Design a protein around this ligand. Structure first.
Ligand SMILES: *[C@@H]1O[C@H](CO)[C@@H](O[C@@H]2O[C@H](CO)[C@@H](O[C@@H]3O[C@H](CO[C@H]4O[C@H](CO)[C@@H](O)[C@H](O)[C@@H]4O)[C@@H](O)[C@H](O[C@H]4O[C@H](CO[C@H]5O[C@H](CO)[C@@H](O)[C@H](O)[C@@H]5O)[C@@H](O)[C@H](O[C@H]5O[C@H](CO)[C@@H](O)[C@H](O)[C@@H]5O)[C@@H]4O)[C@@H]3O)[C@H](O)[C@H]2NC(C)=O)[C@H](O)[C@H]1NC(C)=O
Ligand SMILES: *[C@@H]1O[C@H](CO)[C@@H](O[C@@H]2O[C@H](CO)[C@@H](O[C@@H]3O[C@H](CO[C@H]4O[C@H](CO)[C@@H](O)[C@H](O)[C@@H]4O)[C@@H](O)[C@H](O[C@H]4O[C@H](CO[C@H]5O[C@H](CO)[C@@H](O)[C@H](O)[C@@H]5O)[C@@H](O)[C@H](O[C@H]5O[C@H](CO)[C@@H](O)[C@H](O)[C@@H]5O)[C@@H]4O)[C@@H]3O)[C@H](O)[C@H]2NC(C)=O)[C@H](O)[C@H]1NC(C)=O
Ligand SMILES: *[C@@H]1O[C@H](CO)[C@@H](O[C@@H]2O[C@H](CO)[C@@H](O[C@@H]3O[C@H](CO[C@H]4O[C@H](CO)[C@@H](O)[C@H](O)[C@@H]4O)[C@@H](O)[C@H](O[C@H]4O[C@H](CO[C@H]5O[C@H](CO)[C@@H](O)[C@H](O)[C@@H]5O)[C@@H](O)[C@H](O[C@H]5O[C@H](CO)[C@@H](O)[C@H](O)[C@@H]5O)[C@@H]4O)[C@@H]3O)[C@H](O)[C@H]2NC(C)=O)[C@H](O)[C@H]1NC(C)=O
Ligand SMILES: *[C@@H]1O[C@H](CO)[C@@H](O)[C@H](O)[C@H]1NC(C)=O
Ligand SMILES: *[C@@H]1O[C@H](CO)[C@@H](O)[C@H](O)[C@H]1NC(C)=O
Ligand SMILES: *[C@@H]1O[C@H](CO)[C@@H](O)[C@H](O)[C@H]1NC(C)=O
Ligand SMILES: *[C@@H]1O[C@H](CO)[C@@H](O)[C@H](O)[C@H]1NC(C)=O
Ligand SMILES: *[C@@H]1O[C@H](CO)[C@@H](O)[C@H](O)[C@H]1NC(C)=O
Ligand SMILES: *[C@@H]1O[C@H](CO)[C@@H](O)[C@H](O)[C@H]1NC(C)=O
Ligand SMILES: *[C@@H]1O[C@H](CO)[C@@H](O)[C@H](O)[C@H]1NC(C)=O
Lengths: 120, 447, 120, 447, 120, 447
């Protein structure tokens, strides 16, 4: 029992562009697994929190996509001919770079221009 | 333009990982060692989802769930023998003889009188008992007998209210993990499945500890299959046809009580009453003929060589014998006759395997926690199904001298590991971890 | 010690329309009860998260109220003459239906019209 | 229009549920078995909130908090006797006699010499001891005595530094649960309260294990009340007037030491020094007359029948006697005289209940974990209050032959359960779970 | 392993105005410390949640700053000549007052004017 | 205007607090009592951050990490001796003599024959053993010897597969806490550091249980320092120069086996084979001369008085002797000669400290859990560094009669606490709690 998770992964075999969103012994096992699941969920909420996206499922941002970030071709082919398992191989080697650029470009680039350019 | 970064969250991405599973039991709780207790009740809806266009590889011979469930069964077996009494002061010199006077249980039992310390810690008194001969060894040139396993390990008897009955146990993954299940009609053991579906919980597994033969197991659905280790030692055969097997121990057993110490209540086989016939098992010979004649061809097509069998060598009843757990008893059965079915299938009546009773078991040849079986009062039978076998691969054309083309010398048919049974029920399941983060390029741009 | 909960239930006996918002042995007991309270709170955050309401206390939505959803009369009578214990009896039998309709009408009906009708 | 859906979050909705409570202790920690240790310190502000217009039903006879606190006390009592020494090798044949020579403690004590194994495991030596007669039974036709409970259960003595003093313990609910408390001046047991208030923590409960009489308890505030089970077996009486009771054991006890084994230090009642007078308890007769004469009418108005009392039958000191816990001693007191107050209230001086000391207790008649009481050196008294009784319902007009109208034959006045005391302090509290989600129709509509 | 925390406190010695944002035995130790860290984080999310600031790092509000709230001088001196350790001494004695005034001025003062002054 | 309230979240605010730390071990796992097991593997990057303009005070003599790590070592030592066998039935009358016949190990060993109970619980047999004389006391006027600690505490031998080798252990704070580290070249003990940096994990600490001398420790980097308690009892000296020390026990030891009970396998020192020379330690005298002559001035400048030394008084080998742990042995070494270096530095060859072997240790003089050392077969040496000492402050000019100006009478040089070593490695680290909330006034105002 977690009763909290989303994404029951059913349409994973379909095309990525058209999925578009889904929707004692065992006592010690429970008291370990609940804490593991709770902390693993809160880590996702922390990566989602620093991007200005707490509560959303789909976000945009201001960060441009580099053409070195993965093997880059026509992006419409990437939507039409891949799945998440195929694209996730090309996601790697670019994890920490993008995950630092988003935290720089949201909490610093937007908030400073909100507080300093607009005086109030 | 550079299509800007989007971040989804309902993202189905797999990573192979290892984690801790947990219980799902049917609501049958009324202590039956696996206890149906501190164990999660099942969900009434078996929730699975199909996964088309999925090509997933998963290895049977590296499955973490098997070692997980072996450690679960060992820790449960250790916890269940904790509150019961030790049997330490029973190790004493035994004055034994024949009790009083073919197919007689009393010939395989000895009448042993001995001095035991009472509750007074000074006044030892002479009590008597009956024991099976395979739990007693010798000292001197007359009676002077030792109870076995007084030099190897400590012995604790089981509490008599417990039952050794295998309940079904489902395994489920915690939230944040998924269980991939193959659905092909055959599976070689280590390749890519096609019809893959996720499921929250596995099907029911009865932890039936045995050897030479897999009991109350899952059957294949097209043909008998041969899941083979990489020519390592053994190969698991899974039959299609369940073969009925019955086992019997007739008669009652008068049971007494002996106070070893404070609430240290030894249970004694006082007398054998009803019938003297030995414990025996009985199978239909034609079904067994069909099963062996199928198994020979299933191994023959894969190993490209004509199949033989060999009687196991002398040694441990781990490997020489069958090992049931019928009721509160432990059967050691002599199966060296039953693998000869050309002679056996002539008798259209039925066939008989003789078996012997054991009271003292160093548990399961991998746990070794010495359990003294409590005496079961009563006429007792049990029937079950034969679904699988644990055959050992023949020795190559370097050890046997004679040809090993056309002469696959199965010198044993054993597996001493209780783990290998549990590999024969978890060949379908893989634990995966969901990565729901996701990073993609897209048309939009946030203002 | 949870130090996290809201709604200390004091004005529960008053009218629902005018409440309008409020504001070893024991070691194993602590290590169980803290995890239970944390997971029970995160489940409420998950039901609140998929409705586009993370951080709010009072929300509106676009979902119409069916006149079969409970025993329906003048709704001003429902505000003026009930409490939460009285209304919660009529809430039941309609739990999963509304809790699926909200998750459909927020994360799919608004986000698709945000990303597709507005190109940017 | 259809008034669209709103979702609040500060939503006070109740559901009855069962969960785990926890400690709140006063900051008095200086091992006093309940230990004031690993136990949450109290909050200095008792935080409650009134709840007007609330009609809530809660049942006393199904309260989960009672079984929760019984399991807490049993597990705490088991943990507290774990590091102390066992008393297994003391079970030995005892050579006893009268020590040396009305109201003499030495007449109820025996001088017993016996052989004990020293620290050398070979050289047994003869030591001697004193024991009370109700912890010793016979074997033969001369001295030849057994220490009791060498055939029933194992005995461990308590560590002498511990104290059996009942500390107050508050119970509190974890965050996410609330405790409903009634505040009516009377409560029948199973109906709807009116003045209901929530509270974070209960009031202090002293776990005073006893029977026949409830000690240091909570008193009613208008009249003595009779909380009755549904004519099942018993009924709890809660008095208004606390009745003072004093209990005395005069004189010192010279204490020795005997090394049973390595750090196995038995404590011995070596000699009785000061005064020979038996242990006795003393109450004011007029207050007890008023209390019984009130209790008769409180039971009489409800059960519609005129009230009698009957002396308990022969048997277990669970039910025949009173059972204190004064200091590090266990008093068994003979209360068969005190329920006769028509004779008793004539003596304006005071009345005397005789009591006997017990060293060996199979604990509390529900735990049964055999505790050997350590000897308390010293002149010892203790006083306390009488607040409640555990009366048993009379037998009907089918078992006693004679009329049971006007003859309510209270054949016993007992409750062997320690649980029933704990029902007499948790008749106010209910555990509820908050459902803060809420769904309503409203005027607005989100754009 | 928490993998969730922010503020690795590096620029703490610098001026407060210019920091501007950063970016068995041990088994029982883990199972205690993880639960402690998770609950301590959720308490911060509760104090941040009732202020209308779930997901933000920097907020404004409508609450005026009293000149009795700490030792009050030119506030530009407070930004230019203090650090967080120096200002946190003057923060105390004013904890619960401000932490109640914010919860009053957000969830009650804004939400009532959102729902009642604006009919929809 | 009143500059309205802002709430940041990346807020570096400290509060001093107490919490639970955890492991970080190097990946060297192949049971070596500290076991490198259930212990977090280290991070390959030592992550620290400097903190300029930080003035932080932290006290060495109130550091919670020291008591934390003492409780960790005691609980680990208790867990590691749990599955090993008890040595209870060995307590028996011992018939001893000289084995057979300057610097002879056999002169300090006794040959002891005794009756032990076999696995049969009736047939005791006569076995024999060798023991060191400091583990045996007397009973009678001839042989009649007692194995020591049969009246004090229970003795369990160690499992022979374990190793007493001190592995390095890093301590790290959980997420939500930080570890402040000073970096000054000297630290008086209780003042304000200047060059302060935070770090996620401490450096490696080897739990080397010893006394009179700190082994394999951290050295100071400019001069030898004297961290002093507030004239309380003692003072920790930390040298700059590591002084090499070698210790030797030559020859083999033939080892036998004796079955005490079921799997109760006592290991016996059967015979001494190779060389008869006593166990001895060896240091360079010039380095020790420089170290003492430095330590005298480091204490002299602070305590303003000229420094003396005194040989320790008669009593406990806790304080009279050195206490190594070389291999699976326990050395008690006589250091009353080595503090006289004016005579000692004349011999340019080397100097020799004699040492004695002990099999029975009441563990570490603070745990006291009686461990029987298993016999180590083999020629054995071990070398190590001398980095620190635990000197005791001299007695004042009120107890010694003669002048205590210029006569600082160090009557002992000891610390019996294992805690005080652990104060000599955690003088740098403070646990702080981050308060990330923050409240400030600012120019903005939310609409
Ligand atoms: C492969 O699968 C098959 C199919 O399940 C397995 O066969 C089963 O083997 C079980 C034994 O391991 C059998 O259970 C015994 O069944 C006996 C006969 O049951 C009849 O009545 C029941 C209705 O109650 C009916 O369903 C059934 O069909 C039969 O007609 C029982 O007598 C026997 O009782 C045993 O347990 C009692 C107490 O235990 C009770 O409480 C337990 C909880 O603590 C609970 O789990 C138990 O179920 C039970 O309710 C015990 O006291 C008995 O011992 C003596 O009892 C009194 C004295 O106290 C004395 O008078 C009596 O004669 C006994 O001497 C007794 O040991 C079991 O329930 C099961 O029936 C078999 N199933 C089939 C279809 O035959 C097979 O074992 C599997 N293969 C392997 C290798 O395991
Ligand atoms: C219903 O409620 C009433 C009201 O509370 C209960 O009556 C109480 O019963 C207690 C016993 O269970 C009584 O406690 C004993 O009180 C003795 C006299 O105390 C005097 O001095 C104190 C000030 O210290 C003062 O407040 C009081 O009014 C009296 O004037 C004490 O002597 C006795 O000491 C016992 O404990 C010591 C060691 O225990 C110490 O440490 C414990 C922590 O480990 C801590 O919890 C204890 O409080 C205590 O500080 C023990 O060594 C003593 O035994 C011998 O000690 C030396 C040798 O070592 C020897 O010289 C000496 O003579 C003893 O032979 C001793 O057992 C207790 O503290 C309490 O006073 C009663 N209250 C009242 C108002 O009378 C009543 O019991 C309840 N009903 C029921 C059924 O339980
Ligand atoms: C201050 O720091 C110094 C520096 O570390 C400490 O000195 C060390 O002290 C250790 C002892 O506590 C020494 O370890 C022993 O080293 C012996 C010689 O090792 C040689 O070979 C190794 C390569 O393997 C090489 O690196 C080294 O330099 C030497 O050339 C070893 O023989 C000895 O083995 C011991 O352990 C085995 C089994 O244990 C094995 O498995 C353990 C896991 O369970 C694992 O932790 C162990 O490392 C080991 O791999 C044990 O069976 C041996 O006992 C007998 O074994 C057979 C019979 O079974 C028999 O034939 C044999 O002769 C033995 O009688 C044996 O006890 C240790 O590994 C270490 O070398 C020292 N370091 C230096 C640089 O000298 C010093 O102790 C510290 N100060 C204090 C006060 O502690
Ligand atoms: C065995 O005992 C049962 C009852 O204990 C009895 O009904 C049955 O007839 C007995 N069987 C024989 C063969 O004596
Ligand atoms: C078994 O198969 C081999 C071919 O691998 C063949 O040479 C041999 O003759 C066969 N033997 C029998 C008995 O069929
Ligand atoms: C009991 O002993 C105490 C001290 O142990 C002493 O003060 C007291 O007088 C003694 N009482 C009697 C009656 O001997
Ligand atoms: C007791 O009450 C009953 C009425 O239920 C009455 O008949 C009877 O006489 C009364 N007895 C006495 C002694 O008052
Ligand atoms: C000690 O024993 C080892 C092997 O066990 C052997 O190599 C060595 O020479 C022996 N040493 C002596 C001094 O006998
Ligand atoms: C030691 O120092 C003191 C000064 O505190 C001095 O009076 C004394 O003479 C000195 N003794 C020696 C031997 O240097
Ligand atoms: C063996 O002993 C000799 C001298 O007895 C010594 O030189 C050598 O270092 C020792 N070797 C070991 C491995 O202990």
């Amino acid at each position: 029992l977690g009763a909290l998770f989303l994404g029951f992964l059913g349409a994973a075999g379909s095309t990525m562009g058209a999925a578009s969103v889904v929707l004692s012994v065992w006592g010690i096992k429970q008291l370990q697994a609940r804490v593991l699941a709770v902390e693993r969920y809160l880590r996702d909420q922390q990566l989602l929190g620093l991007w200005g996206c707490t509560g959303k499922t789909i976000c945009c941002t201001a960060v441009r996509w580099n053409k070195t970030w993965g093997n880059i071709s026509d992006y419409q082919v990437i939507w039409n001919n891949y799945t998440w398992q195929q694209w996730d191989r090309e996601v790697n080697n670019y994890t920490g770079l993008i995950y630092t650029l988003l935290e720089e470009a949201n909490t610093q680039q937007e908030k400073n221009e909100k507080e300093l350019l607009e005086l109030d | 333009e550079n299509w800007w970064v989007t971040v989804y969250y309902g993202v189905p991405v797999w990573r192979e990982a290892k984690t801790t599973l947990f219980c799902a039991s049917d609501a049958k709780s009324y202590h039956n060692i696996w206890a149906t207790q501190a164990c999660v009740p099942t969900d009434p809806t078996p929730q699975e989802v199909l996964l088309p266009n999925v090509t997933e590889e998963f290895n049977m011979w590296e499955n973490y769930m098997v070692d997980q469930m072996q450690e679960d069964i060992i820790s449960l077996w250790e916890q269940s023998l904790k509150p019961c009494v030790k049997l330490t002061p029973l190790c004493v010199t035994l004055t034994c003889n024949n009790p009083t006077n073919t197919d007689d249980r009393l010939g395989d039992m000895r009448n042993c009188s001995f001095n035991v310390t009472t509750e007074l810690r000074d006044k030892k008194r002479k009590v008597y008992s009956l024991f099976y001969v395979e739990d007693i060894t010798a000292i001197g040139n007359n009676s002077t007998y030792r109870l076995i396993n007084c030099n190897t390990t400590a012995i604790t008897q089981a509490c008599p209210k417990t039952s050794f009955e295998p309940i079904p146990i489902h395994y489920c993954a915690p939230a944040g993990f998924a269980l991939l299940k193959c659905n092909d009609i055959d599976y070689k053991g280590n390749e890519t499945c096609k019809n893959v579906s996720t499921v929250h919980c596995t099907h029911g597994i009865k932890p039936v500890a045995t050897t030479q033969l897999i009991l109350n197991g899952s059957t294949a659905d097209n043909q008998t299959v041969a899941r083979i280790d990489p020519s390592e030692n053994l190969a698991i055969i899974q039959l299609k046809d369940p073969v009925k097997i019955t086992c019997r121990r007739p008669g009652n057993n008068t049971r007494g009580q002996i106070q070893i110490g404070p609430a240290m209540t030894f249970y004694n086989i006082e007398n054998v009453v009803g019938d003297t016939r030995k414990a025996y098992c009985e199978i239909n010979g034609t079904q067994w003929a069909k099963a062996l004649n199928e198994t020979k061809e299933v191994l023959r097509n894969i190993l490209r060589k004509n199949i033989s069998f060999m009687v196991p060598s002398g040694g441990d009843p781990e490997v020489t014998n069958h090992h049931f757990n019928c009721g509160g008893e432990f059967f050691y059965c002599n199966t060296s006759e039953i693998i000869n079915i050309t002679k056996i299938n002539k008798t259209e009546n039925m066939t008989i395997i003789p078996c012997r009773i054991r009271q003292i078991v160093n548990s399961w040849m991998r746990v070794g926690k010495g359990i003294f079986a409590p005496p079961i009062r009563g006429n007792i039978t049990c029937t079950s199904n034969i679904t699988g076998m644990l055959l050992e691969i023949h020795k190559n054309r370097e050890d046997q001298g004679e040809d090993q083309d056309q002469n696959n010398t199965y010198v044993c048919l054993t597996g001493g590991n209780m783990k290998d049974i549990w590999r024969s029920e978890l060949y379908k399941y893989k634990i995966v971890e969901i990565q729901p983060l996701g990073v993609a390029p897209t048309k939009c741009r946030r203002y």
